[PDB]
C-alpha cells in the first residue's frame, strides 16, 4: 500500500509485480527462412483513408476506414510507424477492392499519421473530439506526445 | 371569464390551469451511460434539402424533403438549431440513399 510505481507485493517468493517502471529492450533474431517475399503476400494498390470517428481517449476511441484495391484477397498486417496512434488490431482481411476498419487510440487533438498496410501506406488525417468521462478505470494505451495544438 | 393570460379556473383545489405565461427553465442531468457513440448511430453523408412546399401558417404548413445518402439504414433524429422553424417530428427513418 506504499510502494512506488503502483507495484503489487507478494511474499512467496518475496517479490513485486506489475511495476509500471521503465521499458524492456527486446531484441529479436528472426531466422532468414521465416521471411516471405513481397510478391507472395497480398499487395495493396490505390488505398484511401478516412477517420469516420475519433474520440481522443485512453481506450481505442478512434475508428478509421481504409478503402483498398487489393491485388488478391487474403490477410495482411497494419501498423502506424509513429507514436501518434496505437492500433487495437494487428492484421486485417481484404477482398479484392472494398473497405476495412481499423481501431486505434490517439494523443493528438488534430491527428495525422501514416497507416502502414500491406506493402503500402496511407496518410490518415482528421480532427478529433474530447472524451466523455474525466476519470477512467484502465491505463493509457496511446503514447503521449507534445503536440496537442489548434 | 376575466383572468389574464387565458387561465382556466377550478375550485377543488382552488387553482388556475393552462396559463400561457412565461417559461419553465428545465434542467436535465443526463447520465453518462445513456450517451451513444457517433460511430454506432446512422451517419449521414452528402445530404441536400429542398422546401417542396411552404405555407407560412400557425400549424405545420411547411414541408421539406431531404435527399440523403446514409452509411447504414435505421433511424435518427432531426432538429433546427434556431427559432426560425419548429418541426412536427423528432426523428426519421433512413434507407441507404433516398429521401425523407
Amino acid at each position: 500500500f506504499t510502494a512506488p510505481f503502483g507495484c503489487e507485493i507478494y511474499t512467496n517468493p518475496i517479490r513485486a509485480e506489475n511495476c509500471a517502471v521503465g521499458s524492456i529492450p527486446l531484441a529479436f533474431d528472426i531466422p532468414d527462412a521465416l521471411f516471405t517475399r513481397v510478391s507472395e503476400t497480398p499487395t495493396l494498390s490505390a488505398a484511401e483513408c478516412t477517420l469516420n470517428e475519433c474520440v481522443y481517449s485512453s481506450d481505442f476511441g478512434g475508428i478509421a476506414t481504409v478503402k483498398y484495391s487489393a491485388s488478391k484477397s487474403g490477410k495482411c498486417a497494419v501498423h502506424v510507424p509513429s507514436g501518434t496512434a496505437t492500433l487495437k488490431e494487428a492484421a486485417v482481411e481484404l477482398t479484392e477492392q472494398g473497405s476495412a476498419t481499423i481501431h486505434f487510440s490517439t494523443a493528438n487533438i488534430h491527428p495525422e499519421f501514416r497507416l502502414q498496410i500491406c506493402t503500402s501506406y496511407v496518410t490518415c488525417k482528421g480532427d478529433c473530439h474530447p472524451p466523455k468521462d474525466h476519470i477512467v478505470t484502465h491505463p493509457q494505451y496511446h503514447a503521449q506526445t507534445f503536440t496537442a495544438a489548434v | 371569464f376575466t383572468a389574464p393570460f387565458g387561465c382556466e379556473i377550478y375550485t377543488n383545489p382552488i387553482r388556475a390551469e393552462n396559463c400561457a405565461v412565461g417559461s419553465i427553465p428545465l434542467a436535465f442531468d443526463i447520465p453518462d451511460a445513456l450517451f451513444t457513440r457517433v460511430s454506432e448511430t446512422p451517419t449521414l453523408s452528402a445530404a441536400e434539402c429542398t422546401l417542396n412546399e411552404c405555407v407560412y401558417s400557425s400549424d405545420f404548413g411547411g414541408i421539406a424533403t431531404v435527399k440523403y445518402s446514409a452509411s447504414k439504414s435505421g433511424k435518427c433524429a432531426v432538429h433546427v438549431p434556431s427559432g426560425t422553424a419548429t418541426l412536427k417530428e423528432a426523428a426519421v427513418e433512413l434507407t441507404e440513399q433516398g429521401s425523407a
Epitope: 494498390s45 490505390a46 484511401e48 476506414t65 478503402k67 483498398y68 484495391s69 491485388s71 488478391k72 484477397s73 487474403g74 490477410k75 482481411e93 477482398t95 479484392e96 477492392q97 472494398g98 473497405s99 | 435527399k67 445518402s69 452509411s71 441507404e96 440513399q97
Partner: antibody
Framework: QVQLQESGPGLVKPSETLSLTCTVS????????WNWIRQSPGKGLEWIGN????????NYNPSLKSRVTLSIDTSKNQFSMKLNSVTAADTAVYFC?????????????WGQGVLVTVSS | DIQMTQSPSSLSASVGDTVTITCRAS??????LAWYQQKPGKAPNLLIY???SLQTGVPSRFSGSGSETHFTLTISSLQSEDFATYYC?????????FGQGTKVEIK
Amino acid sequence: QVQLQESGPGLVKPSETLSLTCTVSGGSISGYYWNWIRQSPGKGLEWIGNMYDSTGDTNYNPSLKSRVTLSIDTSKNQFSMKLNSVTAADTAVYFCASGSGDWFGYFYRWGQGVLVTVSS
Amino acid sequence: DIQMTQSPSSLSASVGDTVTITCRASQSISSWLAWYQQKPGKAPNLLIYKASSLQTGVPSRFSGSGSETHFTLTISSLQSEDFATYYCQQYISRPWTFGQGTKVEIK
C-alpha cells in the same frame, strides 16, 4: 441510394463491336467500382469486368480480357462497355452494377439489364 | 479465378418449408460472400452481404452463415414470392465470381 440504367437493346452483327452505356442517376460515379455482368437467357451470371471509380483502374474476366474495354465518362456520369468481335455466344442480357467491390456498399444496385442479340 | 460451387443446383419445395443452399469457394474468402435472388425477366437482387448481413428491405426469414470456404443461405419458411434462382458470389482473389445458381421451384 443509387440507380443504374443500361442503354437500349438491339442487334450487333457477328465480328462487330457491341457497345453499351450505363447512366447513373441520383448519385455520382466519384466512388466505388462500376461493373458489367451478363446472363445468357436461361443460364447463369458471368462477371465481365469492373472499373474502379476513384482511380479508373480496370479488371476483366480472363476469358474476355482480349476483347473487352471498359471506360468511365465523368461528363455524363456514365460508364461503358465495348466488346469486340462478337459471335452468337455473346447474345445475353447485359447488366451494369457496382460489382467487384466498393469501400461502402457495392452490387447493391443492379441495372435492369439490356438484351443484346448477335445476329446476321 | 476463385471457383464458387453452389449446391444443390435445383430444389423442389412447398410454401412454409425450411430451405438451405450451400456455397463452396475453391480457396478461403474469409466472410466476403454475398447472396442474390433472381426471378425470370428480372435483374438480381442483393439479399445477404458479407456472409451474414441481411440487406435492408429483405425479410428476416433469409439468413446467411459461414466463413472460409463453406457458406449457407437459409430460408426459414419459404413464401410464394421466394420461388426464384439464388446465386452466391465472392468478391475475393482475382476475380469476383458467382456460383452456378440454385433454382427453387414449387413442389
